[PDB]
Design an enzyme around this catalytic site. Sequence first.
Site, PDB file in Angstrom:
ATOM      1  N   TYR A 286       1.310  -8.389   6.746  1.00  0.00           N
ATOM      2  CA  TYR A 286       0.811  -7.981   8.055  1.00  0.00           C
ATOM      3  C   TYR A 286       1.148  -9.020   9.119  1.00  0.00           C
ATOM      4  O   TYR A 286       1.642 -10.104   8.808  1.00  0.00           O
ATOM      5  CB  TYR A 286      -0.701  -7.755   8.004  1.00  0.00           C
TER       6      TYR A 286
ATOM      7  N   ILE B 157      -2.530  -9.678   3.129  1.00  0.00           N
ATOM      8  CA  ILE B 157      -1.825  -8.936   2.090  1.00  0.00           C
ATOM      9  C   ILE B 157      -2.302  -7.487   2.035  1.00  0.00           C
ATOM     10  O   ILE B 157      -3.484  -7.205   2.236  1.00  0.00           O
ATOM     11  CB  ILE B 157      -2.019  -9.578   0.700  1.00  0.00           C
ATOM     12  N   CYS B 158      -1.377  -6.572   1.765  1.00  0.00           N
ATOM     13  CA  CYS B 158      -1.707  -5.152   1.683  1.00  0.00           C
ATOM     14  C   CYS B 158      -2.061  -4.758   0.253  1.00  0.00           C
ATOM     15  O   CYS B 158      -1.179  -4.539  -0.578  1.00  0.00           O
ATOM     16  CB  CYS B 158      -0.536  -4.304   2.182  1.00  0.00           C
ATOM     17  N   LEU B 159      -3.358  -4.677  -0.028  1.00  0.00           N
ATOM     18  CA  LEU B 159      -3.832  -4.307  -1.357  1.00  0.00           C
ATOM     19  C   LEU B 159      -4.963  -3.288  -1.265  1.00  0.00           C
ATOM     20  O   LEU B 159      -5.678  -3.229  -0.265  1.00  0.00           O
ATOM     21  CB  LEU B 159      -4.309  -5.549  -2.118  1.00  0.00           C
TER      22      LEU B 159
END
Length: 152
Positions: free
Chosen positions: A82, A87-89
Amino acid sequence: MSTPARRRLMRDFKRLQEDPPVGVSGAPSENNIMQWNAVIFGPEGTPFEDGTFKLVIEFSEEYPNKPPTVRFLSKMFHPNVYADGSICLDILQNRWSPTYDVSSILTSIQSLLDEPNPNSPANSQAAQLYQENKREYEKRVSAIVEQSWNDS
């Protein structure tokens, strides 16, 4: 002044000492209970296995089940990231369960390194090069890792 979310974090710390997660560490050093010191090492069989990555997990006094905030301290190139560096989780969302511990967040990112999720990627540039030019992607990995590979 006080809150329930804070007390819970105290119960997790002691529980972490009893049996911490293997491969990744996440405990408060000098920084207050708010900011924690965690580090994640690349999985086995990956260009990150030899490299080292450190990240910080920022907590909130909101709720013990409220979606927390996490981001890497070292600026590196990743397949999905991003603008804030988060983090994209799936854990970042409301899917986070209050049953698991902080260790779950450490292992979550660790597995991300092995294989990201092509489902709506944050950085299309990297995700594309992964299937386009592997020679261009590998160079980006060893480069970013080399910077944080040796500090001495």
